[PDB]
Write an enzyme that holds these catalytic residues in place. Sequence first.
Site, short mmCIF file in Angstrom:
data_model
loop_
_atom_site.label_atom_id
_atom_site.label_comp_id
_atom_site.label_asym_id
_atom_site.label_seq_id
_atom_site.Cartn_x
_atom_site.Cartn_y
_atom_site.Cartn_z
N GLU A 198 51.59 10.04 -60.89
CA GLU A 198 51.48 10.31 -59.46
C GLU A 198 50.07 9.88 -59.01
O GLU A 198 49.78 8.67 -58.99
CB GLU A 198 51.90 11.74 -59.05
CG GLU A 198 52.23 11.88 -57.54
CD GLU A 198 52.14 13.36 -57.00
OE1 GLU A 198 51.79 14.29 -57.78
OE2 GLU A 198 52.34 13.56 -55.80
N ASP A 241 48.23 7.54 -55.68
CA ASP A 241 46.91 7.49 -55.02
C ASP A 241 45.80 7.74 -56.05
O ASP A 241 46.04 8.46 -57.04
CB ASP A 241 46.80 8.55 -53.93
CG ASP A 241 47.74 8.32 -52.76
OD1 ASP A 241 48.57 7.37 -52.78
OD2 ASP A 241 47.55 9.10 -51.78
N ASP A 283 44.38 12.02 -53.58
CA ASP A 283 45.34 12.40 -52.52
C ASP A 283 44.91 13.76 -51.99
O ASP A 283 45.27 14.78 -52.55
CB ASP A 283 46.76 12.52 -53.11
CG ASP A 283 47.81 12.96 -52.10
OD1 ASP A 283 47.51 13.11 -50.88
OD2 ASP A 283 48.95 13.20 -52.55
#
Lengths: 553, 553, 553
Positions: free
Chosen positions: C249, C282, C285
Amino acid sequence: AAFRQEANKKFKYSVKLSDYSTLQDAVTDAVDGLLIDINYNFTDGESVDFXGKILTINCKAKFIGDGALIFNNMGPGSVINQPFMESKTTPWVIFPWDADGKWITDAALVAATLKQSKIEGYQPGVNDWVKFPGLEALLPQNVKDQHIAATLDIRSASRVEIRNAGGLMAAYLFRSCHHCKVIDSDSIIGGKDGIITFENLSGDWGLGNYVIGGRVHYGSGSGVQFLRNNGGESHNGGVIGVTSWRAGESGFKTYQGSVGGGTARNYNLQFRDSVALSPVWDGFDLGSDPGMAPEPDRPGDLPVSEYPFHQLPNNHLVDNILVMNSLGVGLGMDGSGGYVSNVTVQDCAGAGMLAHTYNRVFSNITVIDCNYLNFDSDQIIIIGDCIVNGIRAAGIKPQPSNGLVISAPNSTISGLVGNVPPDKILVGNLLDPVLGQSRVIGFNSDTAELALRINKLSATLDSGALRSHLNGYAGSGSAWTELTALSGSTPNAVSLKVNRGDYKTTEIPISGTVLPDEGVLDINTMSLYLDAGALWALIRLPDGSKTRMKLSV
Amino acid sequence: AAFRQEANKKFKYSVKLSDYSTLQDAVTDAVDGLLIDINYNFTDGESVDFXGKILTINCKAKFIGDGALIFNNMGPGSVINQPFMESKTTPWVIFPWDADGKWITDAALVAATLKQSKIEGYQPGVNDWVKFPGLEALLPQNVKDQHIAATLDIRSASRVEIRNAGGLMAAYLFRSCHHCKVIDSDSIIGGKDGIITFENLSGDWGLGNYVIGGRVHYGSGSGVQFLRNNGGESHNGGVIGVTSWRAGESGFKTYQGSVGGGTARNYNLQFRDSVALSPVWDGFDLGSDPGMAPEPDRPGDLPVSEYPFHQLPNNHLVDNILVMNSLGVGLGMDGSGGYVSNVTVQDCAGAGMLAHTYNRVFSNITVIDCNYLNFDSDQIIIIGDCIVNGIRAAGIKPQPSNGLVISAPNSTISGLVGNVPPDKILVGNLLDPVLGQSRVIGFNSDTAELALRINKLSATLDSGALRSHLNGYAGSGSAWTELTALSGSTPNAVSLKVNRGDYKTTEIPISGTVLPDEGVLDINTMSLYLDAGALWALIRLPDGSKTRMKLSV
Amino acid sequence: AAFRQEANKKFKYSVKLSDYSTLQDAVTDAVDGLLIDINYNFTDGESVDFXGKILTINCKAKFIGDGALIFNNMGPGSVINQPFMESKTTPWVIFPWDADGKWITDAALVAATLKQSKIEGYQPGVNDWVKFPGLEALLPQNVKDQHIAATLDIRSASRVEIRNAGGLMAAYLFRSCHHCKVIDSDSIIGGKDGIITFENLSGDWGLGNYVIGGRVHYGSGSGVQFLRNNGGESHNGGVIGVTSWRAGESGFKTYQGSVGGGTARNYNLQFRDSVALSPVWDGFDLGSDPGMAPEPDRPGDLPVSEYPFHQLPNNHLVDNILVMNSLGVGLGMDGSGGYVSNVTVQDCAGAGMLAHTYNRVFSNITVIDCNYLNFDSDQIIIIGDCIVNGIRAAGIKPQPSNGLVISAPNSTISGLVGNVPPDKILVGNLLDPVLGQSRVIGFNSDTAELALRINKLSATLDSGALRSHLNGYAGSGSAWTELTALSGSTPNAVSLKVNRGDYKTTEIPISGTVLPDEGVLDINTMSLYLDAGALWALIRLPDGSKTRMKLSV
Ligand code: NA
């Protein structure tokens, strides 16, 4: 006794405080480790002799008391893990922050915050009488006379480390130590004295003493402070990676002037990768000479005949520091020589920087949204002959009505960036001598410009411009260029224009009155004017004389 | 024996060196901890077998000897706390710094610093013969043949950490190790060899090996050095948060070329948050290929057919580094590709940067007050096709008479800031294509200007300018604008002026001699000239032909 | 028994796991230390009660299992050294990087990387179905249903530190903890869950929780993540000095929206001195409100009536961060207020920054060589009314064909540096109001210029220029200056020239056709034109009327 010898050879040695009835008794019996397994209530001045032993002190409980717990004759290389100093007394404190986190500056409002607490706020003193005028009269004498701190006082040690220190109304004080470090402090809540202090007023100058990592909170004085430390040409000492929040004085401080009749000044220390948040006075206070100048010389230090006050070669290594929301000055310094780089001061209630410095270089500086409480102060102040290379000097807040953005009258500045008001700068010289092929782009506008301003002539009015204007409408494929000059204090009053209306011509200013001879200067130049309804030229000829020629019929 | 079993179950295991008569004997008996409680005098090559055991070695005393103390078969996860390596012999050293901290560069003066010391200076060698020409002849053979260091040599280990290391004439050497770290070094004074070295010439490339925090001093070689380490795409290896002071070679070094017939080069390492102060050669020496190029290929590495010399994709992650007072080059590198950011080189005696690099990007760079000893060198050198975005290139010292400030003939540079001499730059292109609405402000001056200079035409003379001049006096409300051009090598020789004297007219240059037809270029344009005392116009008409019209009577 | 009492008083207490048959049994018997000396295979949900004891847990072996190993009632100040969590199961993982390190983005190619591994790659899930469209259909249900991690779950603790953590398919989870830290992580290889998570959904908001130093690798989720943490005005919480590489992620994440019906949002955290490399989504984030907005309010948080979505005063302290090679967005944030400084995003496959922010200041920003995979995205996006002070926005890669470089339509930007295409910027205003005495230098060119461009008129064509051109040849001592304007969409179409050919005259554009009255604007100005082969002047007189005068004969 086979087992006695076997056991003595195979097990780690440690004693624990709960097996004794004085800290000294435990320390006397210690060989390698010492476990603080129960809280220990000490008396002011309680002194413990470590007999030169190199101990690892593992704390799993608190040292509680008012005053100093004194550790003498620690062996080199000793380590104190997770100490926690807590005052016995719960002092009266002030709390000059409101519920939304904003500064409280009114003396009566600050006085009304007075409460007993060991966990936040600080005990007020002489500095607060100046910071909050009127406060001194509003507080009772017993509050003013308080001096509560639980102090761990380590004396004449070398290479002692304190790791993961904590406390409530706490101080850690090293007296006449060298190569000592305070590492990864765990949000120590300060008391009346500086939170971490290396004091080397006597003996050899302090060397190798550091605060590395971690954080300190509150305290009536400065978060970290040094007295008579010199990191030498190696810069072996200082602060790396530390945060201070809500210091009653300054986040980080090099003492100024004298203490006890001899110098308390510092040289060649690091201040790097560190952060000061909401100090009452300064984020970093790195000067050497005091503002009030109460003595004419420097006992124990370099003489004034060699370096005038505010001109010491302090030579601290200052890089990658951040200050926000200071009530005093974000970054304060003095001295001659040296370098300061990569400084970020943002959103300070008072001035952002006050550098009483000479022959110093400042590179890659950000000082923005400072003086937000509108003190009678400039935002960025440099007193002496310095160089600034790259400075961002405007944030998002409306400008305060008082003061300049920059006051650096003896300095040269290049690379000034931001929406800085052009009339709120005072500098020796502002210079950008090495732009490349360049272009000015106007957005959301019918025009693009390069204006010119001569500060001496007028701080507030452009003296002239090169401007481009669109012809007609977006997408017309046509623009006009003008060269303008100020007259009668009206910007762009006199204007030479190329291609206005897309007529592909030049509109040329001429004098509506008869020009005197002085109206033309250089040889082989012509000025135009009207006389009795005719167009005339005033021309300076190749032989230097002037003549007038009628051009219309 | 109830107690024997109870004790064995409840107490921590540790043995101590003072209960044995060889380090091996103590290690053989160790299970968990090992305490070095007495100094241990080792012999060169003394080898200790840890039998794969995962030990915590707590040092509270020194390892003293000339040569290597060798640790074999350490278990993974072992820790060595506070080791201290000290040479037996006190070597002859040179000390090329004077009492005021300035470099000594004269061979005879450097030779006169020769003394026996274990605590400062370094043992001279082949590099010093080049650095101080003439020195080699001034020293006796036994000084030149010295090779004193107390070396801790850790062999074929994984995940071993050394914490808070110290020493005098010391080296820490990891041979064929992986995931090993040297943390918070305590101002280790180096000896003849690199201070901390990860050597992976054989076996798998080194991976995961770091120096984190702390400081190293002196040494005849480099502070930290790597041989055949590859941090991989993860960049898992290098230096974070370390300082080197007065390295006899370079602060931090990636080896170049071959050692023992195979590559010693390095790839994908970090160099971040670190500081080199006063190295004899470079602050950071990050190149891969050697300057003298003594072999035509790269045994064990990428071939020259794939990457020419100085073009390897070394791809180090270089960010937030600081160098000051280097005698060699502040930052040295080579290779193709990659990024370098946030570099500060200030006050270096030689060049600030020498990048023999291709297709590399440099952003947010400061290289100021370099070459202060006036070597025949440029301050900032880039050899290949690179991009520089934001560079501060002038400090406070007077410029050295030799060399350029920037020599980057194949590079494009934007955002060059400082009082850089415009004639001391050689670049591929200098470009600032995205300025916004702009304004030039002149301080302490009667004028404000945007000058233009064409380097090809003249490096030293502006070719023209847009200039604003005040009319009369401060506060007059009036200025004049001019557009000028160079003629006869005299700046501003030919000048069109708007509003000079506040007459609101235009003074227009005209030819004092009869213009040839070539004196007008574009259709629907007019040039003015004098002929026999009359004003004439030379005009190119809409049909492209040229005509002459008399304007005066 | 003299010895029993002597021994109990002089030896350090520690128990070792190998003397027991459950981790609970060892912990029950522990007093001070606990040594994990043998691997321990745990069951999912295995729970251990530490009885409030303050233990030092020294790990020299692994905890192996699928699911959570739960530690309850740890005493404050406990320390866990060198834990290593390893899954029992070897999961199916994807590996969207090729042999040369490049991203694999094609669903079928990503599906073909599917293999069983505990050491690299990550277990795919719902986010990957969006990131790699088509992938969901290519994988079997049992792969999609996997959820393998060995989790250390520390519950309701205060001041617990984990040092030098490792693992394979590992997670470290703190539930309802405060003042807890994860220090110097040793390249923990993540599993299905976030690698390090502080979850404070219930009870007091999390405070004082940090990840300091070290690195994390892979994981299907984010490297470090926070839920309902508030560092308060002191900013006491966050990430300092950490690296994440190849997060499935994001490197570092503040949760957005709600979890379990109440807010998971975060306020006043630090993100400093940290690095994200090759995250799938990202680098950092840092937003508070989710993009899809599935509820109209914020249960447990500030109401939408007070702060609209994307306008929370999250006030994170973001300074000195670096992102490279993100597939999603390098730096993602939202909110109102606050400061962001010293950010470096370089060589990202997607956008570099996406700031859905209002009234925020960004200073000293580098976002270069972003969107290198040519997504339909702008490189740098700011949605609301912000200020950017100093931004480098061009690297060395050719520009992607899609998108703008900057899209910040409500922002003001100063100090934009680099070879940025002037047509690929959309901003509220671009402003550089405080240049000093300036100079434009042309290198490797016959000309030097300051161009002007009006974006509204044309994004792609300069509207006019001030340009200098050499006369003849290098070293001639002569140049010419021109002021130009755009006409018929042809740059520099209409041009006034001074000293072309070194004739020392002015070439003045005139109209080749008869000018209408509107061809002159200001009083006491003159425009020239041709009429029936004669030169005429159109003049606006001092009384404001217009007249025409014939100048030729
Ligand atoms: Na006439």
